[PDB]
A paper describes a structure:
Here, we investigate the substrate specificities of two enzymes of the M64 metallopeptidase family, the IgA protease ThomasA from Thomasclavelia ramosa and BF3526 from Bacteroides fragilis. In contrast, X-ray crystal structures of BF3526 in complex with substrate and product peptides, combined with enzymology assays, show that this enzyme targets the N-terminus of pre-digested proteins, but does not act on intact IgA. These findings reveal divergent substrate recognition strategies between M64 family members, while providing new structural insights into their conserved catalytic mechanism. Despite containing a metalloprotease domain with a putative zinc-binding motif, ThomasA shares little sequence homology with M26 proteases. This multidomain protein (~130 kDa) harbors a zinc-binding HEXXHXXXGXXD motif within its predicted catalytic domain, a hallmark of zinc-dependent metalloproteinases. Structural comparison of ThomasA323-878 and BF3526-STPP crystal structures revealed a conserved overall architecture of the M64 peptidase domain.
Numbering used by the authors:
A (entry chain A): 21 to 327, 332 to 426
B (entry chain C): 21 to 426
């Protein structure tokens, strides 16, 4: 099947998402070619999760769907901030597609939290277009495999990138990458699925040590320009230099990205099929990086809650570890016992390792999570809950087989 | 007074221009602070040329216009190509403004080739906003002054950047930069106005030697990702990495950018108040770099016309171009009518060329008919002719005087 439509290369597409809270738009930045296809070769027309946006590639001749994938984005977060009620802003976003033999139509769609299409772009890619930038042939960033279970066609390729490390302190970065990798494969189900993964540490250099702190007026020259005070939230570390992130990796096989920042301050986050970014020298580095990978690889939701609006109570979330009980049969109903009370009182929690516990996806009321505590709820707790474990296991099997 | 409203710093604003042939929009990308204001300190509310887009800065308190500038853009040329009927694309663009003391409203407007508004963005810049990225303090790209006629507040600052030169090739770059400076100041009016200019050469390194040649499938890792075949025109050498060009220059006072490409392949490009790009090692390096600076500094139009060219049709025949060296005879009184002798026929027959160094010659602006140029030949039409025509010279002189006074 795969070779009916694709060569063993990557069509990398860089998009800009732009707009404000009332109107959003997608445009094309650049088309690139990478030397191998590291993604999947089966289930090419299906998705593992809905995401908040989707890309669908169709063969122009037949109209068949030949590849699809889904994601979330930082842009869709910025859309909730107060700056989005005032000015129109733009964000870089990058997707890897298998490289087609014949012309292919690519359609990318963003959805809002009511699941309405908020932006859409359909465009034809001609595989012999001379303006497709060929990348990853020379000057490949120095890197080392931490775990090499197989070739990139059969294993899930995870790249760990360096932010705020100079060339002359990569020893520290490779140590931090190993710690992150060890933390990840001490959690089930990653632990028993360890031979499905390749982990490569990529020593992308920065001119300065550390990351930028705008509030202190301390701006640094780093590989990806990460900075605190994102959206004027003091503690929120991000980078928006997505083209620079992917250029650092060109020529190295990769499907998922973890970025490690050389700093002890708390900060970071993960976004489904975008990347994880986290600080490597904070005391909670080990549980936090795994929690972020739960978002960025697992597509899981946050299970903690306050006393909101992101998850409308009349829609079933696409994330697998929270429910509004609108279509609970598609979630973890089948993992409950025939008598588990719905909702599950915290008094009887010892009785119900899996239940339907009120509180999750930031709301105390109307959203429910699968267990009382979980890596997706708190750093102190030692494991993913059984529902998150099944969710992650299903992602792994979608890409590497039962 | 300038210091009524501005400090001696630069507010750099990066925008994204996005759209297709049907619809366009502007969004803000990033605000930056550079350590000195290298631009003008008088005529702050007037424009030397209309351009295809305008920026207007207003004090929020009083509504008063405190700075303005204009430009063209690669995006606005792209909009006239066939690709813009098939996809929506986005482009980086950077503008330097004086850094305000008190909050200011910035209005950026794009106009189409009928000189009507096609996109608009207004936004407020607060001078104490913490996400204004402070640049130009450390890691300043290595550089050498080739000409230093005065400080950056008195003179026009031109930066020449290196593209496709590795660290080991920078002696060659500095030699090429000196050839370009020499070529520039061998054309009038630059020659006589040389003491109004500072020229700095900036040794920005590339990992690979040479530049990308897409038609030949040979891509190169360079500082600014320049490439031939822009809009599928073989000789059109440009970059879309406008943030990277301006980042390389952070901390060096500049107003205009010339980029030298380490290549023998023929090509160049020039866009008003954005940048010039040129091949450094082709035999026509000297006339080309000056030709492209005619676009990027002078805002001049091309005076040539080819049958099979990507740019044909950029100028509608019922609109007077804003560029000073072509006319459609829609508002010729604003152009060079006041330099014609009273008996010059309009249009001027090519047979009578000997008799009229200045006339109204049919052919220019990428159209054989309906657009007219001021002289039979000019730097803006061919590489073999030696000088700018007299209308181009006056146009350039007026730009120099706008910035540095009569
Ligand atoms: K793989
Ligand atoms: K100046
Ligand atoms: Zn989280
Ligand atoms: Zn869980
Ligand atoms: Zn030209
Ligand atoms: Zn001329």
């Amino acid at each position: 099947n795969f070779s009916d439509y694709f060569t063993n290369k990557t069509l990398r597409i860089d998009y800009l998402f732009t707009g404000n809270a009332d109107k959003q738009s997608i445009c094309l930045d650049e088309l690139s070619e990478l030397p191998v296809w590291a993604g999947r070769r089966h289930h090419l027309s299906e998705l593992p999760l809905e995401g908040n946006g989707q890309i669908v590639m169709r063969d122009v001749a037949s109209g068949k769907v030949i590849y699809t994938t889904s994601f979330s984005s930082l842009f869709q977060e910025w859309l909730e901030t107060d700056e989005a009620k005032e000015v129109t802003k733009g964000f870089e976003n990058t997707y890897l597609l298998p490289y087609p033999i014949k012309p292919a139509e690519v359609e990318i769609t963003l959805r809002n939290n009511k699941r309405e299409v908020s932006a859409n772009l359909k465009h034809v890619v001609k595989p012999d277009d001379i303006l497709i930038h060929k990348k990853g042939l020379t000057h490949i960033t120095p890197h080392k495999y931490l775990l090499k279970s197989g070739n990139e066609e059969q294993c899930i390729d995870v790249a760990i990138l360096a932010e705020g490390y100079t060339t002359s302190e990569m020893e520290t970065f490779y140590k931090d990458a190993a710690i992150a990798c060890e933390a990840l494969f001490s959690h089930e189900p990653f632990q028993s699925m360890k031979n499905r993964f390749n982990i490569v540490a990529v020593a992308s250099p920065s001119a300065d040590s550390g990351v930028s702190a705008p509030k202190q007026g301390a701006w640094k020259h780093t590989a990806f320009g990460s900075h605190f005070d994102t959206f004027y939230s003091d503690r929120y570390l991000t980078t928006s230099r997505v083209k620079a992130i992917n250029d650092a990796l060109a020529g190295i096989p990769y499907e998922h990205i973890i970025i490690l920042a050389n700093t002890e301050q708390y900060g970071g986050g993960g976004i489904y099929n975008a990347f994880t970014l986290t600080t490597a020298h904070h005391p909670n580095f080990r549980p936090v990086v795994v929690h972020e990978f739960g978002h960025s690889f697992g597509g899981l939701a946050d299970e903690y809650f306050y006393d909101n609006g992101l998850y409308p109570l009349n829609i079933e979330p696409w994330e697998q570890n929270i429910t509004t009980r609108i279509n609970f049969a598609s979630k973890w109903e089948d993992m409950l016992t025939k008598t588990t009370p719905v909702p599950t009182p915290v008094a009887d929690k010892a009785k119900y390792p899996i239940g339907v516990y009120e509180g999750g996806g930031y709301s105390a009321k109307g959203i429910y999570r699968p267990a009382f505590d979980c890596r997706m709820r708190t750093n102190e707790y030692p494991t993913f809950c059984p529902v998150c474990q099944r969710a992650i296991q299903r992602i792994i099997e979608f890409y590497t087989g039962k």
